[PDB]
Amino acid sequence: APAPFXPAAXAXXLAXLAALX
């Protein structure tokens, strides 16, 4: 059941947005 989901935690990459603090 996890397997779809837990991978996608890759998205935590969003922290890139720091550039704009």
Side-chain angles (χ1 to χ4, degrees):
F5 305 105
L14 286 166
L17 290 167
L20 289 307

